[PDB]
């Protein structure tokens, strides 16, 4: 019933990116029908989306109906474009960040912005992060779980984490670029299994890569309840203890010592799962998020949290808003 | 403290498989040092193992020390060899199954056998299953989470499931053949993340492929606590409801209706994780298993279960032995 850390939005329209940059592989939005649009990647339709995916007015009406005060807006992850030339990804980043900032200016009490960065080129990413924070006024950014062959332990990314600490810029980590073909081409497995696995790999990578140890002021929240991590943390912690030759060469402290060091959203659908999440991650560390407007999201925002007889009213309030305001560094 | 459904053993020695079959890619055991051996795949050492991995006498002494009455013995999963020619995999299967049956005959009150099958060729697999059950006296078999490009929903495998129902042959499903290279080549991620993801994909595949619906007498137990499934079942069940076009074309019943239809081992390391597992899978459906003699296993077998103040003595007894005896169809 309060703040939603996890929601995705796109521009109304954007330019032909293939023409702008000189090579294909990019995505485009095609308005085929009233209140309806297609996303495509060279020719092929790969997703159908509704009006509420780009129209702030439509979003405000649906938020009102559901009792949601603020959405944190970030782009659709397929727009990350970490695969492209660094300056072209940055150019697209500036376009999506400015779009997002425009929307925020129009409804500054209903939205805040999480920008996107050219993470494959750390010098450009630092510079675009500095702009989002100093000029656009964003409290943080949304990044993917890996960047081409870099997982988030990668030393090449340390300048980005350092910039985040100095700028007080929060990081929302979202699974993306999962395997889509072969055995994963059935039963929606990329979204149902691939996403949570991507998130668990990101949490393990930042832990065992020493990111939380070296950048102790960095604020990070992972999407979809930490993936499998809240349930498989015992396996991970035990395995680290047993094979330090494999697990401890970048950071010798046991993963368990980092519980309390980062946030997750609360998007885990079931009450038994939400209770384990808070038991493991902490009542101060779980943030209502919805994945609005996508179907895999929570249909009645805040309902799972409010349905927990195990939680007092002060805990519910932390989960619904107070934790988001802490993670984002924003006034209650 | 009772029965261990999940333990791996190899023969003392076996022939040069490359010479036997006429092409490389197979594994071999090399005794380099006292009570020590190397596993290799063409030249390269990929694992070091101890005596207790092949010597039944050593295993009995370590079981006594730990209060373990019976181990269910199955081969090391890298021996599956589903990639090879069908008759060659079957020939190796017969050798490993006979080895296992010999060991069982020598200590028939301490061991039972779970055989291995040429799953890439279903007619041969049915025939070797019939032999393990009728001639070798095995109560079940261990199979992998996928078979080359077949996940376990594959219709080509239905004759194997049908044979299992008729023969009353239990199936222990073990994750294997994970990605090992690229981004997964660090931090032991194949074992810490890849294995649980493989298991969740296998549980989803058998559910949404209608395997439990079409073969309701089939007994199946998945390794490592069901992977992520006990925590991500809400995500999976919600997603199935939202996109039946993606999820329900082979079996329209919601995955949640199958909780209670299969078993898992109890190998989840942490007490919060063991409580969620029983809450989700059922107190009648969780089986003490250890992954003996591998380091990622439980070091004091049965200790997690016995440490649960939430469980009465009758529940502990089910988890330590009664559930295994039910899954295997064996006399208490
Ligand atoms: Zn999302
Ligand atoms: Zn095992």
From Swiss-Prot, chains A, B:
It is an enzyme of class 4 (lyase). GO terms for molecular function: aminocarboxymuconate-semialdehyde decarboxylase activity; hydrolase activity; zinc ion binding. Its EC number is 4.1.1.45. Pathway: Secondary metabolite metabolism; quinolate metabolism. Monomer. Belongs to the metallo-dependent hydrolases superfamily. ACMSD family. It comes from Homo sapiens (Human). One of its GO terms (cellular component) is cytoplasm. Keywords: Decarboxylase, Lyase, Metal-binding, Zinc. Zn(2+) binds at residues 6, 8, 174, 291. InterPro entries: ACMSD (IPR032465), Amidohydro-rel (IPR006680), Metal_Hydrolase (IPR032466). Substrate binds at residue 47. Pfam families: Amidohydro_2 (PF04909). One of its GO terms (biological process) is L-tryptophan catabolic process. The keyword Zinc applies. It comes from the Eukaryota. This is 2-amino-3-carboxymuconate-6-semialdehyde decarboxylase. The lineage of its organism: Eukaryota, Metazoa, Chordata, Craniata, Vertebrata. It catalyses: 2-amino-3-carboxymuconate 6-semialdehyde + H(+) = 2-aminomuconate 6-semialdehyde + CO2. The keyword Lyase applies. Converts alpha-amino-beta-carboxymuconate-epsilon-semialdehyde (ACMS) to alpha-aminomuconate semialdehyde (AMS). ACMS can be converted non-enzymatically to quinolate (QA), a key precursor of NAD, and a potent endogenous excitotoxin of neuronal cells which is implicated in the pathogenesis of various neurodegenerative disorders. In the presence of ACMSD, ACMS is converted to AMS, a benign catabolite. ACMSD ultimately controls the metabolic fate of tryptophan catabolism along the kynurenine pathway.
């Amino acid at each position: 019933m309060k703040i939603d850390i996890h929601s995705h939005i796109l521009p109304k329209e954007w330019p032909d990116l293939k023409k702008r940059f000189g090579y294909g592989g990019w995505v485009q939005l095609q308005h085929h029908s009233k209140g309806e649009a297609k996303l495509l990647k060279d020719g092929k339709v790969f997703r159908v989306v509704r009006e509420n995916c780009w129209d702030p007015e439509v979003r405000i009406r649906e938020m009102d109906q559901k009792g949601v005060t603020v959405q944190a807006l970030s782009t659709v992850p397929v727009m990350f474009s970490y695969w492209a030339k660094p300056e072209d990804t940055l150019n697209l980043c500036q376009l999506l960040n400015n779009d997002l900032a425009s929307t925020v200016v129009s409804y500054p009490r209903r939205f805040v912005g999480l920008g996107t960065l050219p993470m494959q080129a750390p010098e450009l990413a630092v510079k675009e992060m500095e702009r989002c924070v100093k000029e656009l006024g964003f409290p943080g950014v949304q990044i993917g779980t890996h960047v081409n062959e870099w997982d988030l332990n990668a030393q090449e990314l340390f300048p980005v984490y350092a910039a985040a600490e100095r700028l007080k810029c929060s990081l929302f980590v979202h699974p993306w670029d999962m395997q889509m073909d072969g055995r994963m081409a059935k039963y929606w497995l990329p979204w149902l299994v691939g996403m949570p696995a991507e998130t668990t790999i990101a949490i393990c990578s930042m832990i065992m890569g020493g990111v939380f140890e070296k950048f102790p002021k960095l604020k990070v929240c992972f999407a979809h309840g930490g993936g499998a991590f809240p349930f498989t943390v015992g396996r991970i912690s035990h395995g680290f203890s047993m094979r330090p030759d494999l697990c401890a060469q970048d950071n010798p402290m046991n993963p368990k010592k980092y519980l309390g060091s980062f946030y997750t959203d609360a998007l885990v659908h079931d009450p038994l799962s939400l209770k384990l999440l808070t038991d493991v991650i902490g009542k101060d560390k779980v943030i209502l998020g919805t994945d609005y407007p996508f179907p895999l999201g929570e249909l009645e925002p805040g309902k799972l949290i409010e349905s927990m007889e195990e939680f007092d009213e002060e805990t519910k309030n932390k989960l619904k808003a107070g934790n988001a305001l802490a993670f984002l560094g924003l006034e209650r």
